[PDB]
Amino acid sequence: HEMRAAAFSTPGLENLKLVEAETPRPGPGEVLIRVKYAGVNPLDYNVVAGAVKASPMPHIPGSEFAGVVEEAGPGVTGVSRGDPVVVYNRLYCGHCRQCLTGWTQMCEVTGGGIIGIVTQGGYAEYAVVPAKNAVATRADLKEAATLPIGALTAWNMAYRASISPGEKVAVVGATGNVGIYAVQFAKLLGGEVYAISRRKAKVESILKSAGADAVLTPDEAKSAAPFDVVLDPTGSASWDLSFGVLGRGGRYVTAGALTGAEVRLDLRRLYGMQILVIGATGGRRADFNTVVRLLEAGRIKAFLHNVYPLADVRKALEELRSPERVGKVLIAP
Amino acid sequence: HEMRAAAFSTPGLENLKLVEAETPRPGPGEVLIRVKYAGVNPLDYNVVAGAVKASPMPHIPGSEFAGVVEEAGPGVTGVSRGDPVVVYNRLYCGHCRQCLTGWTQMCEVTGGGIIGIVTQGGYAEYAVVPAKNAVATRADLKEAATLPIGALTAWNMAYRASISPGEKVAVVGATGNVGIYAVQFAKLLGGEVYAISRRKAKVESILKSAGADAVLTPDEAKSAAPFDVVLDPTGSASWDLSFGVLGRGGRYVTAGALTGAEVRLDLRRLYGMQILVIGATGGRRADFNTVVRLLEAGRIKAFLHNVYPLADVRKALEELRSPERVGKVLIAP
Amino acid sequence: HEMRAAAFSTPGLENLKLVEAETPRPGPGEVLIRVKYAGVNPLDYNVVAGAVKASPMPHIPGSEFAGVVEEAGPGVTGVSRGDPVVVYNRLYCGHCRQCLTGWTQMCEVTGGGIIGIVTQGGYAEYAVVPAKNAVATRADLKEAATLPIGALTAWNMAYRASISPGEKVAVVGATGNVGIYAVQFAKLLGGEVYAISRRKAKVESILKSAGADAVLTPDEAKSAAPFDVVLDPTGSASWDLSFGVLGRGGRYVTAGALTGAEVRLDLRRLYGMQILVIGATGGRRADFNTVVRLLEAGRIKAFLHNVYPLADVRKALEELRSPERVGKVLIAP
Amino acid sequence: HEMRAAAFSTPGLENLKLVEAETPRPGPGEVLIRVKYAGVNPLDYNVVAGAVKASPMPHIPGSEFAGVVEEAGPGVTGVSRGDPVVVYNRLYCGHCRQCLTGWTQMCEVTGGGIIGIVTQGGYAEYAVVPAKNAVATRADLKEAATLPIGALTAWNMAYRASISPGEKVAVVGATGNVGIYAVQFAKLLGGEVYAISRRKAKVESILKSAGADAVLTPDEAKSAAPFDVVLDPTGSASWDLSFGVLGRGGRYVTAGALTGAEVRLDLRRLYGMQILVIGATGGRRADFNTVVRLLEAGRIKAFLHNVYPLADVRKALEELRSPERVGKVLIAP
Ligand SMILES: NC(=O)C1=CN([C@@H]2O[C@H](COP(=O)(O)OP(=O)(O)OC[C@H]3O[C@@H](n4cnc5c(N)ncnc54)[C@H](OP(=O)(O)O)[C@@H]3O)[C@@H](O)[C@H]2O)C=CC1
Ligand SMILES: NC(=O)C1=CN([C@@H]2O[C@H](COP(=O)(O)OP(=O)(O)OC[C@H]3O[C@@H](n4cnc5c(N)ncnc54)[C@H](OP(=O)(O)O)[C@@H]3O)[C@@H](O)[C@H]2O)C=CC1
Ligand SMILES: NC(=O)C1=CN([C@@H]2O[C@H](COP(=O)(O)OP(=O)(O)OC[C@H]3O[C@@H](n4cnc5c(N)ncnc54)[C@H](OP(=O)(O)O)[C@@H]3O)[C@@H](O)[C@H]2O)C=CC1
Ligand SMILES: NC(=O)C1=CN([C@@H]2O[C@H](COP(=O)(O)OP(=O)(O)OC[C@H]3O[C@@H](n4cnc5c(N)ncnc54)[C@H](OP(=O)(O)O)[C@@H]3O)[C@@H](O)[C@H]2O)C=CC1
Ligand SMILES: [Zn+2]
Ligand SMILES: [Zn+2]
Ligand SMILES: [Zn+2]
Ligand SMILES: [Zn+2]
C-alpha cells in the first residue's frame, strides 16, 4: 500500500514536494498512526531547509503530530487500533542514567534523536513511532497536536526555572508556539507573568487570555525590571534585554536560538548578581503525560491560527514568518 | 591610642606604606578587634591597585581577618573581651528580602558592601566591624583567617552546584585560595573530585591531601570528560575547556573572573545539553557558621604557604603571583 | 493617655472584661500602632481560656491585627506616623540558625514567642510591636487583618507541601480561617483543589469563589482518592480520612490539633506508600511580605464574616463556634 | 536440567527443605542467572515464616542476590552470558507516572512487587529475573550481594532525609543490614553521624570503621539530642526515642517496622517543631546503579559476617538473630 506524503530529496523549502510514498509498517514495539494533525514549527522549517540534517533521505519531515492508531506491531499492549493518540517526539531507551531519572529527552543511548528528524515524520498520511511514545488522549486532536513541541517545551522551560509563587516572570516571544504556553505554565506555577512582544498592540488581548498579567513591549520590559525569571528561547538578538532585566538570583531559561546562538556573557555580572543561565530542551516523558491531562481537563488552552491541507505544506511552512500569525499552524493530511 | 597599619592615600601597590594610624573605636552594635591574622587574596590586591574603589581614603585594606575582641561597643552582647573571632566580611541589613531568605551577601540595602573595602580593614593592628559579623571560634586563628574569603566562597559555589553523591566534579584553579577549599567541599558532598592545575607535577600530593581523587593537567581533563560539575572561578581563559567538558545536566559554577570576564556562550550547546551556567558570590551568613564549625571539627583543613609581618605587606601581596605558592599567604600585624 | 482594652486577670472567657489601661509607649526599635482591626482565631480563644499561658497578667489578648502607626520609637526609621501596617506576629532575633535561614517562626532565642501571647496584644486601641514586625500595606486593613494568622499559616502549609502543577490537593477544614486561604494557595501553586467540608450544601458556592475546583463531603473525599497532598490542620478526628486518602508519595501537612493531638500512625503504610507527614506552624518573615503583596495585587481574597466592636468582644469570640460562620471574625476597637 | 533449591510449600522455618527443582528457562526480556551469593534478610525470613505472602507456591525465597548470567531470553540486549550481575529486586513497568519520574520501586503496574517474593528467588543455583534488573558490576559478587536490600534501602532513606553538610544524623539500628550502610551514606552526604546501639561496647569499633563519628547507647542518645535527622527502620519500640530527640525541622525516616508498626504521634509536637515523618521503601532503579558504582570505587564497604552453603539455609536464617552478628549473612549456592 502507498500514501501521500511531503518529502524532500535535497534540502530547501522549494524542494519539499507532495509525493506518493510507500506506507510504513510497524515492527515489534511500534504502532502505525494515521496522522490527523501535524504542527508547523521552526524545527520542521529548519529540517526542510537543511539547517538540521535528517535521515532517512529522501525525508518526510514533521516532528509534532497526533492521530489514530491504525495498527499495533508485534507484542504491543497498552495502545490498540482506533485509539486517538498524540506522540512524544523523543526516542528514549528507558535504561540509561538520563531515562531512569526522568530526563528521557537527554537519553544517552538515542542521543536525544527526534521523531521526524531521524525518522520519517508526520507530514504524511501515516507514520510509525514506538508504541511507548504514543499517548492516548480524549482531547480534540487539533489541540493535541500543539503539545509535543510547543506546550511540552514551554513546560520543561518553566519547570527548570524554579518559579516561586509571586515571582515576576517575563516571557520573551510570548506570541510564538512555545511562548503562548510559556505564559500559561508560568501562571499555573504562581508567577506574575509579563508577556513580551514587539506587536503589543495587536496581541495584548490574546496574551491576557493566555494568562498574562501584563503585555509589554521590549522597551516597557526594560523599565519594569527587575524580573526573577526570563523565559526566552528567541536567542542572541534578545540577550542584552533578557540578561539585563534579571535581578538577584534571576534565572534566564532558553530552549532555542531563533535569532542566533552566540551571546557575549559577562561573568562578573553573572556572579555578582547570582544569576543562573539555564538550558532546556524538549521535555520529560512523564511531563508530556501531565501536559496532555491538563489540556484534556481544560486547564491549558490551544491557540490555533490556521489549518492547511497536506498539499499546501509549503504555504503552511511560510506562514511561520507571517507578522500576523499568533497561534499554531497545523497540517491536516 | 595609635596603631600600625598598611594604608594608601592614592591607589597603586607602591603607594601601600606602613603608617601610624588613629586606632578605631566601636560604636553601638560594633566590636573592636585586635587583628592576629589576615589573609592575602586577589580582592585585597585589586583594592590596593585601584580596580575597586575603596573608602574611606586613605584606606587600610584587608577583607579577610581573624583576631581577638579588644572591646565591645554599646549594647553588644554575646561577645566578651578576649573572645577569638573570625569576621564574615559582607555588611548586611538583616531586613531586606535577600537577608530574610538567607542570601545576606546579596543584601539590597548595603550594596553588597564588603568589610575592608567600604570600611577600614584588617591589615592593621586593630579593626572595627559590626558585632553580628564577628563569629566566635575555637580554631587556630591562622586557619580561621582562611575562611571568610577562600573557604566561604568555595562553600557557596559547591552549594549552588547541587552536587549529588557520585557525580564527577572538576575544580579548575584547584591550587588557589578558593579552589583548595572547593576540592574539599566537593568531596564532603560526596563527589568524585578531579583537581585541575597547570602545575600537576608540583602540586599533586597536596591536592590529594585536600581530598582530590585525581589531579589533571588541562589536556588530561579533556580526556576525563564528561563532568557533571565544574567549579571554576578563573574566568575566560578556562571557559572553552570548562564549558566543553560538561556532560548532560552539567553545572558550571563561577565566583570570579581572574583571567577575564567575557566569554562567548553558545546557546545551542547550553540548551542541547541542558547545562546550567551559575553565578556564585560570597556566601550566606548562616553558611559561614557552618564553615567555621567544619574547620573546628577537622572536616576541612587550611593550607598555609607563608606568614608575613605587617611591614612586609608589599611582599605579601606580590606573593599572590608566585608560581611556587600553593596555599594561603597570611599577614600577622 | 489611657486606652480601652479587653483583658483578663484570670483565665476564662467570662473573666474577659473591657477595661481602661495604661496606653503603652514604644521603646527603641518599637512602634505604637493604633489598631483598626484584629482577627478572632482559636489562638485568641485558647489564650483567653487558659489553655495557653499568657504573659503579662493581667493580659490583653489578640495576636492578629492591623492598623496605623501612632508613634515611632527612638531610632526607628523607615516607617512614619500614619503609615498603615499589618503585624507579623512571631518574635525573632535575626541572629540564630533559624532566623538566618529564613525560618523566623522557629527562632531559637525567642522560642517562637507570639505577640498577644507573650506581649499585650491588639484587643485594644493601641499596642506596641517591634518595628521590623510591622509591614506597610496599601490594602484594606480589614482584609489585611486576616493575614498574620489565617493566610500566612496556610501559605506555610502549602509551601511545605511541595505542590507541583496538576497534583490533586484536598483541604480539610476549607471553611475555616486557615482552610479558606489554603484553598487559594493550593490553586495558586497549580494544584487541582478539592475542598472538603462537613457542610457542603451551605458553603459550596463560597469555597468555589475561593478557587476550589470541587467541594466534597468526607464520603465523597474517600471516593475521589487518591490525593497527592492533604492540607489538614483539624487534628485527630480527621486523621483516618486524611491519611487514608493519600496516594503514593503523598504529603499530609498539618498546622493544628483542633479536634485532638494524638493519632495512631501505621509506619508500614507510611513507608509502603512513601508518604510524608509534615508539620507546619506560623510562617516565615519573608513569606509574610509575599502574602501581603498577594492581597494587595488581588491574587488572594479575604472572606469576612462579621465585625464586632471592642465592647462585644466576648460575643465575637463566641462567634467562633457558631455553625453558620464562614469567614473571618474581626474585632474593631 | 534440574538444580538445587531451598523451597517451602507451607510457611514456617521447619518446612524449608532442600529440594531438587526444575531449572528455570528465561523468556523474552529475561536472563537466567547462576546465583553465586544471596543475602539473608528479615524480609527473606518473614517470607519463609509466612508474615509476607509469596507466589508461586511452592516457593523459592531469596530477594537479594548476585551471580553470573547463564542464558538470555529472546530479544535481550545489554546483558550477556558471562556478565557478573547484581539484581535490582523491584519489578517495574517503566511506563507509569512513578517509573517515568524515577520512583521505580513505587510502580503502579507491578504494585512494587519484589523478586523472590512474587517470583522464585535466589536461594537456589539458578534464578530468572528481568534483564533490565540485572546490573553488571566489576565488584566482588560477595559484596555486591549486600546492595539490593541493605545498601539501596539505606541510600533511599538518606536520600529522602535531605541531609545538609554539618547536620546531626542519628542512625538507630546501625549494626543492622540497613543501618550499617545508612551510617556510610549519611557520612558521604556530609552529616555528622551518630550510630545508636544497645551493644555499643561490643560493636563500637566496627561502626566507627563504617564512618560513624560517635556511637551511642539509647540513653546516651536522649542526652545528645537534638538531631537533625533520625534514620530508623526499627519501628515502634524505638519511636519515643527517635521522635523525641528530633530538633527543629527534624526528619524521621523509616523503611521498616521491625519491632512493631504502630506508633502514637503527637501532632502538636509535629507542627510546633516543623518535624517531617517520612516513609521510604526500596530504592530507585537509577540510584541502584549509583550504589554499585560507589561499591566498585570503595566509597562504601560491605560488612560481611558469615557465608553458609545452600544446605545450611535454615541455620543462615536462624543466624539473623545471633546477638554476635554484625554484618551480612550470605548463602552461596
Ligand atoms: N529545544 C527544543 O525542544 C525546542 C526549541 N525551539 C526553539 O525555540 C525558538 C522559538 O520557537 P517558537 O516559539 O516555535 O518560535 P515562534 O516563531 O513561534 O515564536 C518566536 C517569537 O519570538 C518573537 N521574535 C521573532 N523574531 C524576533 C527577533 N528577531 N527579535 C526579538 N523577538 C523575535 C516573535 O514574537 P513577537 O513578534 O510578538 O515579538 C515570535 O512570535 C526556536 O529557535 C526553536 O527552534 C522550539 C521548540 C522546541
Ligand atoms: N566572588 C567572591 O566573593 C570571590 C571571588 N574571587 C575570585 O575568584 C578568582 C580566584 O580567586 P583565588 O582562588 O583566590 O585565586 P588564586 O590565584 O589563589 O587561584 C587561582 C588559580 O587559578 C589558576 N590559574 C591562574 N591563571 C590561570 C590561567 N591563565 N589559566 C588556567 N588557570 C589559571 C592557578 O592554578 P594553577 O597554576 O595550578 O593551574 C591559580 O592557582 C579571582 O578572580 C577572585 O577575584 C575570590 C574570592 C571570593
Ligand atoms: N500553627 C499556627 O501558627 C496556627 C495554628 N492554627 C490551628 O489550626 C487549626 C484550624 O484553625 P482555623 O482555620 O482557625 O480553625 P476554624 O475553626 O476556623 O476552621 C476549622 C474547620 O474545620 C472543620 N471542622 C471544625 N470542627 C471540626 C470537627 N469537630 N471535626 C471535623 N472537622 C471540623 C470545619 O469546617 P466544616 O465544618 O465546613 O467541615 C471548620 O470550619 C486550629 O487547631 C488552630 O489552633 C490556626 C492558625 C495558625
Ligand atoms: N522497605 C524496604 O524496602 C526494606 C525494609 N526493611 C525493614 O527494615 C527493618 C530493619 O532491617 P535490617 O537492617 O535488615 O534489620 P537488622 O536486624 O539486620 O538490624 C536491626 C537492628 O536494630 C536493632 N534492633 C533489633 N531488634 C531491636 C529491638 N528489639 N529493639 C531495639 N532495637 C533493635 C539491632 O541493633 P543493636 O543490637 O546494635 O542495637 C539490629 O541490629 C526490618 O523491619 C526490615 O524488614 C529492610 C530492607 C528493605
Ligand atoms: Zn536512555
Ligand atoms: Zn539586607
Ligand atoms: Zn532567631
Ligand atoms: Zn511502573
The per-residue DSSP string of D248-307 comes to EEEEEEES--TT-SEEEEEHHHHHHTT-EEEE--S--HHHHHHHHHHHHTTSS---EEEE
Strands B227-231 and B168-172: parallel
Pair type for strands D227-231 and D246-254? parallel
Q: Report how far apart, in Å, the C-alpha atoms of B238 and of each of A219, A266, B196, B262, B268 are.
A: 35, 14, 11, 11, 20
> Side chain identity at B316, as an amino acid letter?
A
Residue C178 Cα distances to A123, B238, C153, C183, C282, angstroms: 53, 53, 7, 9, 11
Give the other-Cβ count within 10 Å of A211's Cβ. Answer: 18
By the 8 A CB rule, do D43 and D118 touch?
no
Annotated binding site of C for NADPH: 90, 153, 175, 177-178, 197-199, 255, 257-258, 281-282, 325
Could you tell me whether strands B126-130 and A276-279 are parallel, antiparallel, or unpaired per DSSP bridges? unpaired
> For residues A191 and A187, what is the distance between their CA atoms, to the nearest angstrom?
5
Residue with CA at minimum distance from ligand 1 atom 44? A256
Contacts of B201 (CB under 8 A, 6+ apart): none
Residue nearest to atom 23 of ligand 3 (CA): C173
Please check whether residue D154 is in contact with residue D187, taking contact to mean a CB–CB distance below 8 angstroms: no
- DSSP tally for chain D: helices H, then strands E: 11, 16
- What's the first-to-final CA gap in chain C, in angstroms? 16
Cell of A93: 531507551
Judging contacts by C-beta atoms under 8 Å, the chain A residues touching residue D94 are: 94
* Strand order through the sheet with A227-231: A214-216, A192-196, A168-172, A227-231, A246-254, A276-279, B276-279, B246-254, B227-231, B168-172, B192-196, B214-216
Written in H, E and C, the secondary structure of C281-329 is: CCCCHHHHHHHHHHHHHCCCCCCEEEEEEHHHHHHHHHHHHCCCCCCEE
Which run of H or of E encompasses A95? none
CA C150 to chain centre: 3
Give the number of residues written for chain C. Answer: 333
How big is chain A, counted in residues?
Answer: 333
Q: Which atom of ligand 1 approaches the CA of A175 most closely? A: 41
Contact of B252 with B275, CB cutoff 8 Å: yes
Q: Cell for C36?
A: 483598626
Neighbours of chain A (3+ CB pairs under 8 A): B, C, D
Count CA atoms closer than 13 A to D251's CA, side-chain side: 20
Q: Which residues of A91-130 are buried (b: 16+ CB within 10 A; e: fewer)?
A: bbebbbbbbbbbbbbbbbebebebbbbbbbbbbbbbbbbb
For residue B271, give the chain A residue with the closest CA: A279
Q: From C188, C275, C172, select the one nearest C230 (Cα to Cα).
A: C172
Give the separation between CA D243 and CA D246, rounded to whole angstroms. Answer: 6
**Ligand 1 atom with minimal separation from the A238 CA:** 31
Give SS3 for A153: helix
Return d(Cα A107, Cα A103) in angstroms, integer.
7
In order of their start, the domains of chain B are 1-147+282-333 (3.90.180.10), 148-281 (3.40.50.720)
| Beta carbons within 10 angstroms of residue D201's beta carbon | 8
CA dihedral D261, D262, D263, D265 (to 10 degrees): 120
Using DSSP's 3-state secondary structure scheme, residue C190 falls into: coil
> What is the separation of C-alpha C250 from the centre of its chain, rounded to a whole number of angstroms?
24
Of C254, C269, C271, nearest to D280 by CB-CB distance is C271
The set of cell numbers assigned to D318 is 536462624
* Residue B319 phi, psi dihedral angles, 5° rounding: -60, -15
The SS3 call for residue A268 is: helix
Q: Of A103, D300, A279, give the one whose Cα is nearest residue B166.
A: D300
Cβ density class B125-138: b for 16+ within 10 Å, e for less: bbbbbbbbbbbebe
CA distance readout (Å), B18 to A236, B5, B124, D66: 51, 6, 9, 71
Nearest chain C alpha carbon to A155:
C165
Which one-letter DSSP state was computed for residue D129?
A: E
Torsion (CA) D241, D242, D247, D251 in degrees, nearest 10? -170
**Which among C41, C181, C234, C278 is the best mutation to test ligand 3's pocket, defined by most ligand atoms within 8 Å of the CB?**
C234
Q: B9 exposed, middle or buried (CB, 10 Å; 0-12, 13-18, 19+)?
A: exposed
Cβ contact D189–B297 (<8 Å): no
Chain C residues whose beta carbon lies within 8 Å of the beta carbon of residue A190: 188-190
Separation of first and last alpha carbons in chain A: 17
On the 0-12 / 13-18 / 19+ scale of CB atoms within 10 A, D22 is exposed
Residues of D in contact with B286 (CB under 8 A): none
- Pocket residue to mutate for ligand 4, from D178, D238, D321, most atoms within 8 A of Cβ: D178
Helix (H, G, I), strand (E, B) or coil at A154: helix
Q: Which residue of B has its CA nearest to C134?
A: B95
Q: Between the CA of residue C267 and those of C165, C257, D218, D249, D284, what are the distances in Å?
A: 28, 20, 21, 20, 20
Q: Which of D95, D132, D289 sits opposite A97 (nearest CB)?
A: D289
> Are the C-beta atoms of residues C303 and C326 closer than 8 Å to each other?
yes
Task: Classify residue D148 by its DSSP letter.
Answer: I
Q: What does the alpha-carbon distance between residue B322 and residue B313 come to, in Å, rounded to a whole number?
A: 15
Distance D280 CA to ligand 4 centre (A): 14
Numbered residues of chain D with Cβ closer than 8 Å to any chain A Cβ: 28, 75, 78, 94-95, 97, 100-102, 104, 132, 284-286, 289
Q: Do B274 and A108 touch (CB under 8 A)?
A: no
Q: Count of CB atoms within 10 A of residue D255's CB?
A: 27
Sequence-ordered strand ranges (E) for chain A: 2-7, 17-22, 30-40, 65-72, 84-87, 126-130, 134-136, 168-172, 192-196, 214-216, 227-231, 246-254, 262-266, 276-279, 304-309, 328-332
Owner of C-alpha cell 507546619: C280
| Chain position carrying cell 499495533 | A72
Of the candidates C107, C110, C105, which has an alpha carbon nearest to the alpha carbon of residue C255? C105
- Distance separating alpha carbons of residues B65 and B123, to the nearest angstrom: 8
Residues of B in contact with A273 (CB under 8 A): 279
Using alpha carbons, select from D13, D291, D303 the residue that is nearest to residue D148. D291
What's the reported resolution, in angstroms, to a tenth? 2.3
Q: Where is D7: in which H helix or E strand?
A: strand D2-7
CB C157 within 8 A of CB C280: yes
Binding residues of C for Zn(2+): 93, 96, 99, 107
Distance from CA of C108 to the nearest CA of D (A): 9
How far does residue A251's CA lie from ligand 1's centre (Å)? 19
Task: Point out the residue among B255, B267, B273 whose CB comes nearest to the CB of A263.
Answer: B267
CA of C3 to the centre of ligand 1 (A): 64
For cell 524505638, the residue is D238
At C147 the three-state DSSP class reads: helix
Place of cell 530526563: A103
Amino acid at D307: V
Those residues whose C-beta lies under 8 Å from the C-beta of residue B304, and which sit 6 or more positions away, are: B142, B143, B146, B327, B328, B330
3-class DSSP string for chain B:
CEEEEEEECCCCHHHCEEEEEECCCCCCCEEEEEEEEEEECHHHHHHHHCCCCCCCCCECCCCCEEEEEEEECCCCCCCCCCCEEEECCECCCCCCHHHHHCCHHHCCCCCCCECCCCCCCCCECEEEEEHHHEEECCCCHHHHCCHHHHHHHHHHHHHCCCCCCCCEEEEECCCCHHHHHHHHHHHHCCCEEEEECCCHHHHHHHHHHCCCCEEECHHHHHHHCCEEEEECCCCHHHHHHHHHCEEEEEEEEECCCCCCCEEEEEHHHHHHCCCEEEECCCCCHHHHHHHHHHHHCCCCCCCEEEEEEHHHHHHHHHHHHCCCCCCEEEEEC
C-alpha B156/C-alpha A271 separation (Å) is 11
- Give kind and range of the element (H or E) at residue A281: none
Distance C258 CA to ligand 3 centre (A): 6
Q: Which residues contact D294 (CB under 8 A, 6 or more apart)?
A: B165, B166, D188, D300
| H helices present in chain A, as ranges | 42-49, 97-100, 141-144, 152-160, 177-188, 200-209, 218-224, 239-244, 267-272, 285-296, 313-318
Q: How many CA atoms lie within 13 A of B285 on its CB side?
A: 30
Residues across chain D: 333
Tell me whether residue A2 is exposed, middle or buried, using C-beta atoms within 10 angstroms of its C-beta: 0 to 12, 13 to 18, 19 or more: exposed
Q: Which residue has the cell 557558621?
A: B289
Q: Within a 13 Å sphere around the CA of B7, how many CA atoms are in the beta-carbon half?
A: 19
Nearest Cα of chain B lies from the Cα of D81 at a distance, in angstroms, of: 28
Angle between helical axes of D200-210 and D179-188 (0-180°, round to 10): 40
Q: Report which of D258, D202, B160 is spatially closest to residue A275, judged by C-alpha positions.
A: B160
Determine, for residues A166 and C290 on separate chains, whether the beta-carbon distance falls below 8 Å.
Answer: yes
Distances (CA, A) of A222 to A71, A194, A248, C107: 54, 12, 16, 39
Contact assessment for residue B60 and residue B124, using Cβ atoms and an 8 Å cutoff? yes
Task: Check pocket membership of C234 for ligand 3, CB cut-off 6 A.
Answer: yes
| Backbone phi, psi, residue D248, to 5° | -60, 130
Distance of CA C278 to the CA centre of its chain: 18
Instruction: Using most ligand atoms within 8 A of CB, pick from B266, B271, B274, B275 the residue to mutate for ligand 1.
Output: B271
Residue D139 CA: distances (Å) to CA of A279, D86, D147, D297: 36, 10, 11, 9
Cβ of B290 and D188 within 8 Å? no
Are the C-beta atoms of B63 and B116 separated by less than 8 Å? yes
CA dihedral sign of residues D207, D212, D215, D218: negative
**Any idea which ligand is nearest the CA of C109?**
7
Chain B residue numbers with beta carbons less than 8 Å from the beta carbon of D185 are 165
- Which cell is B263 given? 566569554
Nearest chain D residue to A99 by CA: give it. Answer: D100
Identify the bridge partners of residue A38 per DSSP, sorted by sequence position. Answer: A65, A331
Phi then psi dihedrals of residue D44, to 5 deg? -65, -30
What is the rounded CA–CA span in Å between residue A119 and residue B327? 56
In 3D space, the residue among B290, B332, B284, B238 whose CA is nearest the CA of residue B106 turns out to be: B284
The CA–CA distances, whole Å, from B225 to B170, B219, B256, D143, D250 equal 9, 10, 23, 29, 38
Q: What's the gap in Å between B249 CA and the centre of ligand 4?
A: 37
- H or E segment and range at residue C27: none
D170 - beta bridge partners? Answer: D194, D230
Q: Which 3 state secondary structure label does DSSP give D85? A: strand
Closest residue by CA, ligand 1 atom 31? A238
D276 closest CB neighbour out of C98, C236, C276:
C276
Cβ contact A322:A328 at 8 Å: no
Of C103, C149, C178, the residue with max ligand 3 atoms within 8 A of its CB, to mutate for a pocket test, comes to C178
Residue B65 Cα, gap to closest chain D Cα (Å):
23
> In 3D, which of B88, B92, B89, B72 has the Cα closest to residue B80?
B72
Probe site for chain D from A30, A76, A95, A100 (most D CB atoms < 10 A): A100
Q: What HEC string does C220-256 produce?
A: HHHHCCCEEEEECCCCHHHHHHHHHCEEEEEEEEECC
**How far apart, in whole angstroms, are the C-alpha atoms of residue D152 and residue D284?**
8
Grid cell at residue D185: 551514606
CB-CB contact of C129 with C87 (8 Å): yes
Compute how many other C-beta atoms are within 10 angstroms of the C-beta atom of residue B102: 18
Q: Count interface pairs B-C at CB distance under 8 A.
A: 24
DSSP secondary structure code for residue A151 in this structure: I
| Phi and psi at residue D328, to the nearest 5° | -85, 135
Cβ atoms B37, B65 nearer than 8 A: yes
- D94 alpha carbon – ligand 8 mean position (Å): 5
